[PDB]
Design a protein around this nucleic acid. Sequence first.
DNA 1: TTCA
Length: 179
Amino acid sequence: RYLMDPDTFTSNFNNGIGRHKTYLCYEVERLDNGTSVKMDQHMGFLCNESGRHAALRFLDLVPSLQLDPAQIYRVTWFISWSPCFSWGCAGEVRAFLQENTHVRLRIKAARIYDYDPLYKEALQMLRDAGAQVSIMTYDEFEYCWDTFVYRQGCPFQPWDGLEEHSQALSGRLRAILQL
DNA sequence: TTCA
Ligand SMILES: [Cl-]
Ligand SMILES: [Cl-]
Ligand SMILES: [Zn+2]
C-alpha cells in the first residue's frame, strides 16, 4: 500500500481548524478465538470528491474488501469531519448497515461538521443504526500518524490545544447522543 | 480556510 503525506494529515486532522476537504482513514478487523486479525489489504485512506463525500466513497469500495457474511467485522473510520445529514450520507450509511448486518462500524471524528445544521440528526441516526460514534483522542491521532502517514520514523507531534478540543468535542457528542 |  502507501501512506499519507504528513502535511496533508496535519492540516486535515487538526481538531481546532477546519478545511474545505474531508479525509478518512479506515481499517477492518475481525475477532477470532479472542485475537485481533487486521489485514494490511483492509487498511487505507481516501478523501472526498466533487459531489461525493468521503463516507460514501468508503461505501463504494466495500465490495473490493471481499468481506464474508459468515463473520462479524469491525470497521473503524478515522474521519476528519463527522458525517453529514443534509446531503444524504448518514441515511446512506444507515441503509448500508441495515443491508450488511455483519459489518459493525466505529466512526471516530476529529471534528464535528456543524456547518450542516442537521449535524446532530446525522450522529443520532448513525448511533440508532448500530454505529459507535466517538471523537478522536490524542492516542487515536497518534495511532493514525503511526499507522497511515508517511512519517519516516518521525514521532507524532501534537498541535497546541489538541486535548482541549478533543475533550470539548467529546462532551458535545455525549450531550447530542444522550437520551 | 466547516466534504469551497
Ligand atoms: Cl458525510
Ligand atoms: Cl458547543
Ligand atoms: Zn455527507
